[PDB]
Amino acid sequence: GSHSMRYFYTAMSRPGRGEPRFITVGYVDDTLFVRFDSDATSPRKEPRAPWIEQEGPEYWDRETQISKTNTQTYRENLRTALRYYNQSEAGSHIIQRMYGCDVGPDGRLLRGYDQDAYDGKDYIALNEDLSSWTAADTAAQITQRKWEAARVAEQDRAYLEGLCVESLRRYLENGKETLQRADPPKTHVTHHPISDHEVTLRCWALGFYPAEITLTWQRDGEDQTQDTELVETRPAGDRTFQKWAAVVVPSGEEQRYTCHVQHEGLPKPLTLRWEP
C-alpha cells in the first residue's frame, strides 16, 4: 500500500585526518538501493538493489554529481556550524540529513520531509506544510533566515511533490517483485527453564519484510509491557528482519500467556502459545 523513499547524509569531520567524510544512502521502504562514500577509491553513486541497475548512465552521472556537490556543501556546513556554536576546530562533529517522501497506494504524496541534525541533535526541519521551517536553537535560526531569504522551502516543495514521488513510483514498478511483496513472519514460541519455578517464554518472528512489526505478550488477556523483554528489530542480512519478545513466567502457568503478532504480510494478527 503505502511507500517511502529516503536519502540519508552523514558528514563527519575528523581534524588531522583529512577532509570530512560524506556518505549518502538511499532507501525505498526498508530496502537500500544506492550509496555514495567520499572515501571510496573513485567516489560515485553505486547501485545496491537489482532494480536500480537499469537506470542509464545519465542517471548515474547526475546522481554522482549531486553527491560530489553535496560533499563540498556539507563540508562547508561543518565549518559554518563551528562558527555558529563558537566551537574549536579541534573536535570531530557530525551533520546528518534525512529527506524524502511518503506516498499512498495511488502514489500521491502523503507527506514530505527534509531535516538536519548537528552532533545527533535536531538542527532544522522543513515543516509538514513544505513552506516553513522549525529551527532548534538560535544557531539554526540563522540558517532559517538564510533559507527564508532564498526561498529554499519552495524549491524543496517542488522536488517533494514532483521528482521525489515520480522517481519513487518508477522504482516501485521496476522493483515490484520485491518492494511490493510483504514477507510474513515465521513465528514460534520457545521454552527455557530458568530455575525450578521460573520459565522464559520467547516469542520469535523471523524472515519478515518490511521491518514494521508488533510482538506483545498477554497474561490472562492483559498486555505485559513492563514484564516483556523486547529486542530491537534486527536485519537478517537477506533483506528480511527478526524480532523476539520474552516473558518470565511461573512454572505451570505457561498456558495463561499468549504471544500476539501483527505484520502487514499477515491477513489477521496471529495468536501463539507455547506448544508442549
Binding site: 549531486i66 562547508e76 556546513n77 556550524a81 529527506y99 538564510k146 533559507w147 524549491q155 524543496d156 522536488y159
Partner: peptide, 10 residues
Amino acid sequence: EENLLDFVRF
C-alpha cells in the same frame, strides 16, 4: 532520485 538543489548552505 535526489533533489539537485545546489546552493543551499547553513
